[PDB]
Amino acid sequence: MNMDWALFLTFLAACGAPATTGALLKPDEWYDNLNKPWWNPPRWVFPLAWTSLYFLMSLAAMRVAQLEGSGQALAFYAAQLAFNTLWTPVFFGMKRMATALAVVMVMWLFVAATMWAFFQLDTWAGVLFVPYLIWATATTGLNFEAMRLNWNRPEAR
Amino acid sequence: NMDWALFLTFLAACGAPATTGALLKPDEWYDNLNKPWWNPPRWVFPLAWTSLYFLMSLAAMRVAQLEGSGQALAFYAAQLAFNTLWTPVFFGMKRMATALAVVMVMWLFVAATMWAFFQLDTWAGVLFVPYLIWATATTGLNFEAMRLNWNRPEAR
Numbered sequence: 220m221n222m223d224w225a226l227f228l229t230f231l232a233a234c235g236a237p238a239t240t241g242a243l244l245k246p247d248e249w250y251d252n253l254n255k256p257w258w259n260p261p262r263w264v265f266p267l268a269w270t271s272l273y274f275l276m277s278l279a280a281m282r283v284a285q286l287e288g289s290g291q292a293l294a295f296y297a298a299q300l301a302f303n304t305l306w307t308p309v310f311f312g313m314k315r316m317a318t319a320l321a322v323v324m325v326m327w328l329f330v331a332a333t334m335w336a337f338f339q340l341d342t343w344a345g346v347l348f349v350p351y352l353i354w355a356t357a358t359t360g361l362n363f364e365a366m367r368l369n370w371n372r373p374e375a376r
Numbered sequence: 377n378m379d380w381a382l383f384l385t386f387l388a389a390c391g392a393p394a395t396t397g398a399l400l401k402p403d404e405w406y407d408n409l410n411k412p413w414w415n416p417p418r419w420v421f422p423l424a425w426t427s428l429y430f431l432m433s434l435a436a437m438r439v440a441q442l443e444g445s446g447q448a449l450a451f452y453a454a455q456l457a458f459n460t461l462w463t464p465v466f467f468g469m470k471r472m473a474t475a476l477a478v479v480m481v482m483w484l485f486v487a488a489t490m491w492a493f494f495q496l497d498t499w500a501g502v503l504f505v506p507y508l509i510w511a512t513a514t515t516g517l518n519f520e521a522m523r524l525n526w527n528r529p530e531a532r
C-alpha cells in the first residue's frame with residue numbers, strides 16, 4: 220500500500236467531471252427565490268466542501284484499487300461518481316427538483332455501498348468516505364426541503 | 377463468466393448517462409443547427425449508446441475480477457463520469473465549445489481504458505473498440521457543430 224500517484228491523479232481527474240458541473244453554474248435568481256431551511260449553508264461553502272471530498276474520495280479509491288478483490292468496491296465507486304455528476308445539471312440546470320431527489324437518493328445509496336465495500340477491504344478507505352456520506356445526507360435533505368418548501372412546476376411527461 | 381453482481385452494478389452506473397439522454401432529448405434547437413454531411417439519423421444514437429452501455433459494462437465486469445485491475449477501473453470511472461457530463465453541457469446548457477473539451481477528455485479516457493483493458497483481458501479490450509470508434513465519431517460531431525454554426529454565440 221503506497222501513495223500511487225497514477226491511481227490518485229486518475230481518480231482526481233475523474234472528479235473533474237462533477238467539478239465542471241459546478242463551474243458552469245451562474246448566479247441563479249430561481250435558486251435565490253427558493254425558501255431554504257435555516258441550516259442551508261451559504262453558496263460559497265459548497266465548492267470548498269466538494270473539493271475536499273474529491274480529494275478524500277480519490278485518496279480512498281487509490282488505496283482500495285491497490286488491494287486484491289476490490290472489483291465490486293470500484294464498481295460501486297464508478298456508480299456513485301456517475302450519479303454525482305448527474306445531480307447538479309438536473310437540479311440547477313433543468314430545475315427538475317423531483318427527479319433530482321431521485322438522483323441524489325440513488326447517489327446516496329451508491330455512496331453508502333462504496334463506503335461499506337471500502338470498509339471490508341481497508342478501514343482507512345472507509346473512514347475517508349464517512350464525511351462524504353454525511354455530506355450526501357445533508358445534500359439529500361437540502362433537495363427534499365427545497366421541494367417541500369417551494370412551488371414546483373410540472374416537468375416533462 | 378458472469379459475475380452478475382459486478383455486471384449489474386456497472387450497468388446501473390450507466391443509468392446516470394442514460395438518464396441525461398432521457399431528460400434532454402434533442403429539441404428544435406438541435407434540428408436547426410447546421411449538420412455535417414455524414415450526420416446520422418436520430419434513431420442511430422439510442423441504438424448506439426444502448427449497445428455501448430451493455431458492451432462497456434460486460435468488459436468492466438471481466439476486468440474487475442482480475443489481479444491488478446485497479447488502474448483500468450480508475451480509467452473506466454473517469455470515462456463514465458465525463459460521458460455523463462457531456463449531454464447536459466451540449467444539449468442542456470448549449471455550451472458547444474465546453475462540450476468539445478469534455479468529449480475530448482472522455483475520448484482520452486476511453487482510449488486509456490481500452491489500452492488498460494487489453495493489458496489484462498483481450499476480450500475486454502475488444503468490447504471497447506466500438507466505443508472508441510463511436511467516441512471518435514462523437515468528437516467529430518461536436519467539432520462539426522461548432523465549425524458549421526460559428527455565427528451562433530452558443531458555438532463560440
Ligand code: HEM
Binds near residue numbers: 425459
Ligand atoms: C459523450 C457524448 C454523448 C453521450 C454520452 C450521449 C448520450 C445519449 C444517449 C444515452 C441517448 C439516448 C437517450 C434515450 O434513448 O433516451 C442520446 C440520444 C441522442 N443524442 Fe447523444 N450522446 C452523445 C453525443 C451526441 C452528439 C455529439 C450528438 C449530435 C451532435 C448527439 C445527439 C443525439 C441524438 C440525435 C439523439 C437521439 C434523439 C432521439 O432519440 O430523438 N449525441 N444521446
Ligand SMILES: CCCCCCCC/C=C/CCCCCCCC(=O)OC[C@H](O)CO
Binds near residue numbers: 235238240242
Ligand atoms: C496509455 C497509458 C495511459 C495514458 C493515460 C492518458 C489519459 C489521461 C488523460 C488525462 C486528461 C486530464 C483531464 C483532467 C480533467 C480535469 C477537469 C478540469 O479541468 O476541471 C477543472 C475545472 O476548473 C473545475 O470545474
Ligand SMILES: CCCCCCCC/C=C/CCCCCCCC(=O)OC[C@H](O)CO
Binds near residue numbers: 260261264
Ligand atoms: C480550525 C479551523 C480550521 C480552518 C480550516 C480552513 C477554513 C476554511 C473555511 C471554512 C469555513 C467553513 C464554515 C463556513 C460557515 C459559514 C456560515 C455562515 O453563514 O457565514 C456567515 C458569515 O457572516 C460569513 O460572512
Ligand SMILES: CCCCCCCC/C=C\CCCCCCCC(=O)OC[C@H](O)CO
Binds near residue numbers: 221222271282
Ligand atoms: C468543520 C469541517 C472543517 C474541515 C476542515 C478540515 C479539512 C481536512 C481535509 C483533509 C484532511 C487530510 C486527510 C488526509 C488523508 C490522507 C489519506 C492518505 O493519503 O492515505 C493514503 C496513503 O498515502 C497510502 O499509504
Ligand SMILES: CCCCCCCC/C=C\CCCCCCCC(=O)OC[C@H](O)CO
Binds near residue numbers: 291381382384388394
Ligand atoms: C442502461 C441503463 C440500465 C439501468 C438499469 C441497469 C440494471 C440495474 C439492475 C439492478 C440495480 C443494480 C443494483 C446494484 C447491484 C447489486 C448487486 C450487488 O451489489 O452485490 C453486492 C455484493 O455481492 C456484496 O459483496
Ligand SMILES: CCCCCCCC/C=C\CCCCCCCC(=O)OC[C@H](O)CO
Binds near residue numbers: 325328332394395398
Ligand atoms: C434510465 C433508468 C435509470 C435507472 C437508474 C439507475 C437504477 C439504480 C437501481 C438501483 C440502485 C441500487 C443502489 C445500490 C445499492 C446496493 C446495496 C447493496 O447491494 O449492498 C451491498 C453491500 O453493501 C456491499 O458489500
Ligand SMILES: CCCCCCCC/C=C\CCCCCCCC(=O)OC[C@H](O)CO
Binds near residue numbers: 497
Ligand atoms: C486519433 C488517434 C487515434 C489513436 C488510435 C490508438 C488509440 C489507442 C492506442 C493504442 C491501442 C493499443 C491497445 C493495445 C495495446 C497492446 C495490448 C496488448 O499488449 O495485447 C493485446 C491483446 O491482449 C493481445 O495482443
